[PDB]
Curated annotation (Swiss-Prot), chains A, B:
A family per Pfam: DUF1508
Species of provenance: Agrobacterium fabrum (strain C58 / ATCC 33970)
Organism superkingdom: Bacteria
Coiled-coil stretches noted in the UniProt entry, renumbered to this chain: none
Entry protein name: UPF0339 protein Atu0232
Amino acid sequence: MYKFEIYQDKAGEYRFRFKASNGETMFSSEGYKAKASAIHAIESIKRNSAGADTVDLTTMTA
Amino acid sequence: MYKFEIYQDKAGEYRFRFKASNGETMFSSEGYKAKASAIHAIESIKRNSAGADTVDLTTMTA
């Protein structure tokens, strides 16, 4: 199906990506701070993120 | 409760963050490419991400 793949970048930058059913990544994160911070971040997603609202701030006249 | 705030960075970098019930951000993304790509990414989350698995690659980093 899909999941959160938690890796660190060459820069030592702990991060996590999320996949899709067609076996493709749709985002990569900053990872927040560290591995412990990475899982804790993903813990937010596990709660109700599939039901969470999607607000767009960047609808700004420029 | 909590939601996805979609903004663009000073670098013109479309991205989205996710909040927590205590009114605090837990990640910021790369936003994938653009606004359309940002929402499409968040669409993956809406599906089953609250039930998605959490796999850590950086225990044996690649």
